[PDB]
Amino acid sequence: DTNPRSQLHSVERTFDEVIDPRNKNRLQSLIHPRKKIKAVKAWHFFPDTSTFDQVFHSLKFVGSASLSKDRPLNEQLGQVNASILTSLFKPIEINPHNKWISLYAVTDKLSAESFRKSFNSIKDDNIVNRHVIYDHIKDFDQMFRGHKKLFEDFAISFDDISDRAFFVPIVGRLELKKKRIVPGLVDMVNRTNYAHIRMDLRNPSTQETAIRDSRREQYDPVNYSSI
Amino acid sequence: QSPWLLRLELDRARMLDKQLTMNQVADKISEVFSDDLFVMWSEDNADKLIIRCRVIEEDQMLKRIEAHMLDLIALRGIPGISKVYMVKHKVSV
Amino acid sequence: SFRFCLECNNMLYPKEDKENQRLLYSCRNCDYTELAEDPKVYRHELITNIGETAGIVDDIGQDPTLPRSDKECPECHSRDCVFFQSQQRRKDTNMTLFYVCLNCKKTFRDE
Amino acid sequence: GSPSEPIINFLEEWGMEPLEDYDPAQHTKSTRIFVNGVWTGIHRDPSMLVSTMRDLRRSGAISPEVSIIRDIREREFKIFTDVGRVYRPLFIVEDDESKDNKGELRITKEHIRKIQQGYDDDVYGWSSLVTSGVIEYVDGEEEETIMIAMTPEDLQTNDTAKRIKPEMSTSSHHT
Amino acid sequence: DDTITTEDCWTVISAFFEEKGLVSQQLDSFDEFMETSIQDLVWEEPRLILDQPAQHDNINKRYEIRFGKIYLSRPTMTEADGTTHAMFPQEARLRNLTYSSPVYLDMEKSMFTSIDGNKVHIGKVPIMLRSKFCSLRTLDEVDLYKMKECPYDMGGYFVIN
Amino acid sequence: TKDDFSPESKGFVENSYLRGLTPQEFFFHAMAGREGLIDTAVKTAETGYIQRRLVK
Amino acid sequence: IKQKLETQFTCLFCNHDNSVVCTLDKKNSIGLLECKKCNLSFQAPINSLSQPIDIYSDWIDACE
Amino acid sequence: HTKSVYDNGETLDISLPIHPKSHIPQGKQDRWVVKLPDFLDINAEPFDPRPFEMNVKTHEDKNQELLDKLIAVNTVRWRYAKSETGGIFKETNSQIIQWEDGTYSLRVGSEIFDMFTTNTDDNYLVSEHNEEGILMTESTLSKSVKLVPASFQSTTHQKLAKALSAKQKKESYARSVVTKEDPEERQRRLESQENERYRLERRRKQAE
Amino acid sequence: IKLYGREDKGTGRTIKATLPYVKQDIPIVIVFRALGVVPDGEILQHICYDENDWQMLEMLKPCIEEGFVIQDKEVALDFIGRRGSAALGIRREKRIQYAKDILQKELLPHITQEEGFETRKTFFLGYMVNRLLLCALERKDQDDRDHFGKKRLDLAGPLLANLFRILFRKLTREIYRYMQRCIETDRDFNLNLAVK
Ligand SMILES: [Zn+2]
Ligand SMILES: [Zn+2]
Ligand SMILES: [Zn+2]
């Protein structure tokens, strides 16, 4: 099957044999080759258009940096918590030798819930000015590993109403370990980070939106190419 | 005295097999240690044979005392004679 | 069993208060201190039996080199089982057998 | 000697998880996977993995002189492609319970007739037997995990001049 | 099917010895050596580097040579009068020669400078008899007799002096 | 099989030389003979040294 | 207990070699380096695992 | 009581621009991270049949060509499908199949690959904002998913086994050559030339 | 990885690890911290795989007590670098770099050779210490030295490969020496004369 025409024909054959998820009879027709078990539900596998412009990294805590293990930290941040789901990370590097990550979160449950609800409901062109203040919690040592291929890792999110599954690329993996600050460097530590950070929600500028659309034009040119 | 307590559980079967008395072990500990350690011992009828001790940061000191006690407390017998067997000898008289 | 520090993950050494007369587990790398629940600071076993039956795995019934008996299972009363001796390998170790059923996979003796 | 890269590719294809994604508290029942003495990952269903590796080796996908060892007691799964390992060939007994041929040799009179002729009925030599799954090589380390019948007469259950064979009555049945 | 007799086992053993022989390990190891090991050993340290920051107008000059491919030949014999001819093991045994073949290596030279090459004979490697690089591997039964070699001889050894 | 303490599993040869040994018995008997040869060829030097010291 | 040992270190003031002596006192957790020619004295704290190389490296760090 | 190190209270008035999302997760902000196997590739670009036909590469090495063919036919793709009503719709060749036991499987064409899910704690997805140098979290990665071939009889597994078996069979580095003269001839002739030019250079230097 | 201390003698049963190009043995906790995992709990997580086994934890306790003096990665690397048998008087930063080199390379080279890949080295160190503890606690017999599946045979191939490696290194050194001598004369050498 080294013929390019044969490969193209195989591609169109694979494209044409997609089973409609709403077709229950055809779904039950499909049988597992080994398990011999009928299919129950199906979901389409599609890429995500609005997230290709952004850069995504899989962030993990290694060892004792686990939030569940740190019981007082978990109790302070709430026993899924919206504070964890809306946390901020601020990488600051004084020099190549010394590096760490700054973690911020919303202590108040109501403010974090309002911010999370506002962030997860962005489908219109009206955003309220939510001046949310983030408080520093802890710092960790970081290491980074890069992926040679673009789509080495991908996270899958589901959508039951549309029977689809949206996947996003992963650029790299970030690992964090607990860092004990040296007592002789606390004077310089106090001058690096901040006790509070205020986040203001504003509508994106036209030029930045055009830049992001130009970046997305690589994936989807039908609905986003400039005219 | 100190709040730290030291109690050791001794096997009843092997203690009876060696034909030893708890009072004898108590006197041995008292002799080797004078009044530096207060000692109490459960009676014969106890379900589990135990003998406690109390001193008169000292957790490590008590650990070293316990290790020394386990190591070199000689109840009875000739030192160096690890085991003894009974043998029958056929002798012409 | 010994506990670890909840803030810097080091070992919690026991400590005694002179004024309060309490046993407390304290980390020497910080000021964290948690109240001890039991007074059992240390326990040493001169003669121990741990590791005799602790060497058990859940896939031991797939080993073809193990002998197969017909002893009765105490739980599900199966007619097939796999036996072996003690996993501890000291000179004083007994020659008693441990039987493993092929359905419930529990370890039981014959006495 | 054989390269270990296809072995790692096959292992990663069949569900092996690397060391960086491994937590000893979470994985209290996973099997450590060694390749040429290097701990490369872990797995939670070692039976399917060892079955797949052995079937691939018996089909010629993996080189026949590669060692596949499963230590059930220590929860380890070791693979060796090193140079200098001494091995010997053995007949393979069909050990699949779901098969009808359970407890019987895989080699039949058809294989013997093909060997005598010298070709297959649509060169047929020793290598054809090895890559057909009726013969395989085992080294001294893999021998510790297998059960070997001395003669094909041993696979099925008062003269003063004939030698006497062991009873082997300690086990009710032998596989 | 039908049962497998002891004669079938001896048929299988005969197939084994027909394919492998009795000295297969020696020949296979030597063939692996000659085929890949020499090239890998050469490519272990493939770059010799010499630098000279000449100041005598600072010119930093790096001189480096790369090792390329390994070329092997069938064993040859060079006479005192200068001629050459193909060597065979019986002649090496009779005249106390060494049965060995020349090894050639590609050396590439480059002249790096910053202001701020063909086959070389590297030696002769003795050849194991009846291996892939021996002259007797191809010869059939008749030419083996013409070469005064015994057909029962199995190889697996070297001829030094 | 594992954990077998029967006589045939641990080196008891129940056949005679006239009857013929089984392969397991053959291997165990070869192990014992190897022990004998090693013991002789190892103790000879110690015995010779003792004899020399006694003579001197 | 003070421990006096002859070392083959090089003094950075007099440049004479094999004229460095390390004196460490484990009881008070101190270590003294004295130059047999320069008569200079260097003091640095020591730990339970301390060795003369530790005090020598500490002196090197202090000198620069 | 570990006192808080930071008490200055200095605050940055930084405002981040955020774009609307084409989809929103419902009930749980959970995503599953999936490792990409060697036999599977992701083609986010829309399927263009004519460039795909015009860019097929043929190599002498059968194993490399077979691997490229397998990964190309197994590549996840998508394309625009013209609806019968005149509209345009996104059409894909990949689906997710859930069996009765609750397990999930990724399906591309007739090939089905099983999913093995391992629960992971304290694993989240973040979005990098390089222009501001901060990382904004997105959701939680609860489970890690590995892709495993369904069975031996699957064509993908057979092609992978064939490619990996025949890949290590080809091994021949040394190239044969024919020697027509004595190898040491180059060495002796260059020694003679070097000695001649040494004598000429010595004569010139004595005459200089 | 030696296990010092006899039964009921020598106070604590410390575990010291011998390292290449290091003059004196090193406790396991210090090298574990040097690799880049400081907390003692995670060191025990790497070493032991079942928390209910109090005996191995008790045997590791003296090592934790001895290694408590070191509490940072950089001081641990420096402590490695002092004993690294290098030239006396090397500066602290250069000592730390030397320790990083001797830790990345020549410490379990068969695992990996690249930077930032020391997680597998820590896991393998935990595995070795676990095997040492399992043998020390009479849970397993010591390894059979005479077992034949742990042996290898070197045929003509490997022996000739080792010999050819030595001879080729000698030839390369001769080529290097001749090149150094020839660059004095500054001539366009034919390169067919350097090779012997
Ligand atoms: Zn603490
Ligand atoms: Zn049962
Ligand atoms: Zn001086």
mmCIF file of C-alpha atoms in Angstrom, chain H residues 6-198:
data_model
loop_
_atom_site.group_PDB
_atom_site.id
_atom_site.type_symbol
_atom_site.label_atom_id
_atom_site.label_comp_id
_atom_site.label_asym_id
_atom_site.label_seq_id
_atom_site.Cartn_x
_atom_site.Cartn_y
_atom_site.Cartn_z
ATOM 1 C CA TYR H 6 5.979 38.964 53.866
ATOM 2 C CA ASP H 7 4.246 41.911 55.540
ATOM 3 C CA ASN H 8 5.192 44.931 53.376
ATOM 4 C CA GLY H 9 1.777 45.035 51.695
ATOM 5 C CA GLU H 10 3.107 46.309 48.352
ATOM 6 C CA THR H 11 0.649 45.571 45.550
ATOM 7 C CA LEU H 12 0.883 45.511 41.744
ATOM 8 C CA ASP H 13 -2.026 46.833 39.673
ATOM 9 C CA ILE H 14 -1.637 44.366 36.810
ATOM 10 C CA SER H 15 -4.620 43.644 34.556
ATOM 11 C CA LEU H 16 -4.733 40.497 32.406
ATOM 12 C CA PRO H 17 -6.610 40.332 29.075
ATOM 13 C CA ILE H 18 -8.826 37.246 28.789
ATOM 14 C CA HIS H 19 -10.620 35.895 25.649
ATOM 15 C CA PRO H 20 -13.932 33.993 25.545
ATOM 16 C CA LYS H 21 -13.757 30.202 25.430
ATOM 17 C CA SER H 22 -15.430 28.157 22.694
ATOM 18 C CA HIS H 23 -16.481 25.582 25.319
ATOM 19 C CA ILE H 24 -16.983 25.429 29.089
ATOM 20 C CA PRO H 25 -16.648 22.281 31.251
ATOM 21 C CA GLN H 26 -19.800 21.295 33.132
ATOM 22 C CA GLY H 27 -20.008 19.967 36.685
ATOM 23 C CA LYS H 28 -16.260 19.424 37.121
ATOM 24 C CA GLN H 29 -13.115 21.216 35.934
ATOM 25 C CA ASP H 30 -11.405 17.889 35.256
ATOM 26 C CA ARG H 31 -9.155 16.957 32.339
ATOM 27 C CA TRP H 32 -7.274 13.750 31.540
ATOM 28 C CA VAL H 33 -3.649 13.938 30.406
ATOM 29 C CA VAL H 34 -2.826 11.371 27.715
ATOM 30 C CA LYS H 35 0.668 10.310 26.676
ATOM 31 C CA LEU H 36 1.163 10.174 22.911
ATOM 32 C CA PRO H 37 2.351 6.752 21.679
ATOM 33 C CA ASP H 38 4.784 6.326 18.809
ATOM 34 C CA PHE H 39 2.108 4.796 16.549
ATOM 35 C CA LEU H 40 -0.270 7.750 17.064
ATOM 36 C CA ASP H 41 0.173 11.334 15.859
ATOM 37 C CA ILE H 42 -1.895 14.514 16.130
ATOM 38 C CA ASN H 43 -2.595 16.631 13.035
ATOM 39 C CA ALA H 44 -4.355 19.774 14.262
ATOM 40 C CA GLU H 45 -4.203 21.179 10.717
ATOM 41 C CA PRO H 46 -7.325 20.638 8.567
ATOM 42 C CA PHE H 47 -7.057 17.700 6.182
ATOM 43 C CA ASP H 48 -6.059 18.841 2.676
ATOM 44 C CA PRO H 49 -6.178 15.831 0.291
ATOM 45 C CA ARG H 50 -4.144 17.346 -2.566
ATOM 46 C CA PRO H 51 -1.081 18.483 -0.499
ATOM 47 C CA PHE H 52 -1.312 15.198 1.439
ATOM 48 C CA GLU H 53 -1.136 13.248 -1.829
ATOM 49 C CA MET H 54 1.643 15.487 -3.179
ATOM 50 C CA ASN H 55 3.826 15.166 -0.041
ATOM 51 C CA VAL H 56 4.001 11.368 0.316
ATOM 52 C CA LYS H 57 7.665 10.418 0.755
ATOM 53 C CA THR H 58 9.185 7.127 -0.406
ATOM 54 C CA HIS H 59 12.369 5.771 1.178
ATOM 55 C CA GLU H 60 14.553 2.785 0.329
ATOM 56 C CA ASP H 61 14.393 1.608 3.960
ATOM 57 C CA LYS H 62 11.229 -0.505 4.126
ATOM 58 C CA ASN H 63 10.956 -0.206 7.925
ATOM 59 C CA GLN H 64 10.965 3.609 7.913
ATOM 60 C CA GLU H 65 8.432 3.708 5.058
ATOM 61 C CA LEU H 66 6.178 1.213 6.861
ATOM 62 C CA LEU H 67 6.399 3.244 10.085
ATOM 63 C CA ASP H 68 5.521 6.435 8.186
ATOM 64 C CA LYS H 69 2.592 4.682 6.475
ATOM 65 C CA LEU H 70 1.286 3.340 9.801
ATOM 66 C CA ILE H 71 1.567 6.665 11.628
ATOM 67 C CA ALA H 72 0.015 8.503 8.645
ATOM 68 C CA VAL H 73 -3.004 6.194 8.391
ATOM 69 C CA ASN H 74 -3.334 6.253 12.204
ATOM 70 C CA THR H 75 -2.891 10.043 12.548
ATOM 71 C CA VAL H 76 -5.765 11.904 14.196
ATOM 72 C CA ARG H 77 -7.123 14.393 11.659
ATOM 73 C CA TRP H 78 -10.083 16.657 10.974
ATOM 74 C CA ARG H 79 -11.579 18.436 7.983
ATOM 75 C CA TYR H 80 -14.418 20.726 6.967
ATOM 76 C CA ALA H 81 -17.545 18.865 5.829
ATOM 77 C CA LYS H 82 -19.976 20.687 3.547
ATOM 78 C CA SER H 83 -23.462 20.139 4.957
ATOM 79 C CA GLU H 84 -26.410 19.335 2.695
ATOM 80 C CA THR H 85 -28.078 22.587 3.839
ATOM 81 C CA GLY H 86 -25.186 24.703 2.518
ATOM 82 C CA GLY H 87 -23.473 25.258 5.865
ATOM 83 C CA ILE H 88 -19.973 24.251 6.926
ATOM 84 C CA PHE H 89 -19.315 21.810 9.768
ATOM 85 C CA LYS H 90 -16.205 20.415 11.438
ATOM 86 C CA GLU H 91 -15.810 16.669 10.825
ATOM 87 C CA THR H 92 -13.284 14.394 12.543
ATOM 88 C CA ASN H 93 -12.138 10.806 12.028
ATOM 89 C CA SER H 94 -11.591 10.056 15.738
ATOM 90 C CA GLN H 95 -14.087 9.043 18.428
ATOM 91 C CA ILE H 96 -14.149 7.989 22.082
ATOM 92 C CA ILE H 97 -15.918 4.733 22.975
ATOM 93 C CA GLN H 98 -17.049 3.827 26.500
ATOM 94 C CA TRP H 99 -17.858 0.195 27.261
ATOM 95 C CA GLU H 100 -20.269 -1.242 29.829
ATOM 96 C CA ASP H 101 -17.520 -1.665 32.447
ATOM 97 C CA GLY H 102 -16.923 2.111 32.457
ATOM 98 C CA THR H 103 -13.559 2.000 30.684
ATOM 99 C CA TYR H 104 -12.839 4.389 27.816
ATOM 100 C CA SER H 105 -11.259 3.686 24.431
ATOM 101 C CA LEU H 106 -9.919 5.959 21.698
ATOM 102 C CA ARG H 107 -11.082 4.963 18.208
ATOM 103 C CA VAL H 108 -9.564 6.143 14.916
ATOM 104 C CA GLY H 109 -11.184 4.476 11.918
ATOM 105 C CA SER H 110 -11.413 0.754 12.592
ATOM 106 C CA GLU H 111 -8.532 0.810 15.096
ATOM 107 C CA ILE H 112 -9.406 0.868 18.806
ATOM 108 C CA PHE H 113 -6.890 1.664 21.558
ATOM 109 C CA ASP H 114 -7.745 1.037 25.201
ATOM 110 C CA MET H 115 -7.205 3.649 27.916
ATOM 111 C CA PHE H 116 -5.635 2.915 31.309
ATOM 112 C CA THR H 117 -6.397 5.641 33.855
ATOM 113 C CA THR H 118 -4.235 6.266 36.932
ATOM 114 C CA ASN H 119 -5.382 8.739 39.581
ATOM 115 C CA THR H 120 -2.954 11.615 40.184
ATOM 116 C CA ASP H 121 -3.080 14.085 43.071
ATOM 117 C CA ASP H 122 -1.939 17.737 43.058
ATOM 118 C CA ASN H 123 -1.714 17.842 39.249
ATOM 119 C CA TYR H 124 -3.180 20.861 37.455
ATOM 120 C CA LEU H 125 -3.080 22.559 34.062
ATOM 121 C CA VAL H 126 -1.875 26.163 33.796
ATOM 122 C CA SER H 127 -1.658 28.740 31.014
ATOM 123 C CA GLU H 128 1.641 30.561 30.493
ATOM 124 C CA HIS H 129 1.647 34.350 30.020
ATOM 125 C CA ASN H 130 5.216 35.020 28.884
ATOM 126 C CA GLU H 131 4.647 38.732 28.176
ATOM 127 C CA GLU H 132 3.768 39.253 31.864
ATOM 128 C CA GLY H 133 5.910 36.388 33.195
ATOM 129 C CA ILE H 134 3.154 34.729 35.251
ATOM 130 C CA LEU H 135 1.330 31.400 35.052
ATOM 131 C CA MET H 136 -2.484 31.322 35.177
ATOM 132 C CA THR H 137 -4.090 28.027 36.184
ATOM 133 C CA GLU H 138 -6.765 26.454 33.977
ATOM 134 C CA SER H 139 -8.142 23.236 35.542
ATOM 135 C CA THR H 140 -7.186 20.045 37.404
ATOM 136 C CA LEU H 141 -5.516 16.977 35.862
ATOM 137 C CA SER H 142 -7.034 14.253 38.039
ATOM 138 C CA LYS H 143 -6.144 11.179 35.954
ATOM 139 C CA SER H 144 -3.215 10.173 33.747
ATOM 140 C CA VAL H 145 -4.266 8.113 30.723
ATOM 141 C CA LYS H 146 -2.087 5.652 28.792
ATOM 142 C CA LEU H 147 -3.037 4.288 25.368
ATOM 143 C CA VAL H 148 -2.699 0.525 24.854
ATOM 144 C CA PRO H 149 -3.474 -1.543 21.716
ATOM 145 C CA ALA H 150 -6.636 -3.615 22.054
ATOM 146 C CA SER H 151 -5.367 -6.967 20.768
ATOM 147 C CA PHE H 152 -2.648 -8.804 18.870
ATOM 148 C CA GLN H 153 -4.817 -9.117 15.740
ATOM 149 C CA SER H 154 -5.009 -5.313 15.401
ATOM 150 C CA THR H 155 -3.164 -4.165 12.279
ATOM 151 C CA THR H 156 -1.308 -1.419 14.178
ATOM 152 C CA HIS H 157 0.245 -3.911 16.613
ATOM 153 C CA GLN H 158 1.257 -6.272 13.793
ATOM 154 C CA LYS H 159 2.853 -3.446 11.782
ATOM 155 C CA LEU H 160 4.704 -2.191 14.879
ATOM 156 C CA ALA H 161 5.957 -5.710 15.646
ATOM 157 C CA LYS H 162 7.081 -6.218 12.032
ATOM 158 C CA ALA H 163 8.851 -2.836 11.925
ATOM 159 C CA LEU H 164 10.645 -3.363 15.241
ATOM 160 C CA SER H 165 11.615 -6.941 14.353
ATOM 161 C CA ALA H 166 13.039 -6.054 10.936
ATOM 162 C CA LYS H 167 14.638 -2.815 12.186
ATOM 163 C CA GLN H 168 17.222 -4.648 14.314
ATOM 164 C CA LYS H 169 17.851 -7.292 11.628
ATOM 165 C CA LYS H 170 19.716 -4.853 9.352
ATOM 166 C CA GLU H 171 23.207 -4.341 10.803
ATOM 167 C CA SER H 172 26.218 -3.943 8.501
ATOM 168 C CA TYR H 173 28.639 -1.048 9.077
ATOM 169 C CA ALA H 174 31.955 -2.244 7.628
ATOM 170 C CA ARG H 175 32.239 -2.080 3.832
ATOM 171 C CA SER H 176 34.412 -4.530 1.905
ATOM 172 C CA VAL H 177 37.206 -3.433 -0.441
ATOM 173 C CA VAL H 178 39.858 -5.057 -2.654
ATOM 174 C CA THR H 179 43.561 -4.458 -1.985
ATOM 175 C CA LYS H 180 45.614 -4.524 -5.201
ATOM 176 C CA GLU H 181 49.005 -3.626 -3.736
ATOM 177 C CA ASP H 182 50.887 -3.646 -0.442
ATOM 178 C CA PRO H 183 49.167 -1.269 2.058
ATOM 179 C CA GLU H 184 52.495 0.100 3.381
ATOM 180 C CA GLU H 185 53.320 1.567 -0.081
ATOM 181 C CA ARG H 186 51.735 4.936 0.767
ATOM 182 C CA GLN H 187 53.731 5.147 4.012
ATOM 183 C CA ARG H 188 57.107 4.399 2.401
ATOM 184 C CA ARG H 189 56.509 6.640 -0.632
ATOM 185 C CA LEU H 190 55.515 9.549 1.622
ATOM 186 C CA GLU H 191 58.578 8.932 3.829
ATOM 187 C CA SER H 192 60.718 9.087 0.677
ATOM 188 C CA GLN H 193 59.033 12.329 -0.452
ATOM 189 C CA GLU H 194 59.401 13.838 3.030
ATOM 190 C CA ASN H 195 63.093 12.881 3.183
ATOM 191 C CA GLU H 196 63.648 14.430 -0.263
ATOM 192 C CA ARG H 197 61.957 17.683 0.735
ATOM 193 C CA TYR H 198 63.848 17.675 4.055
#
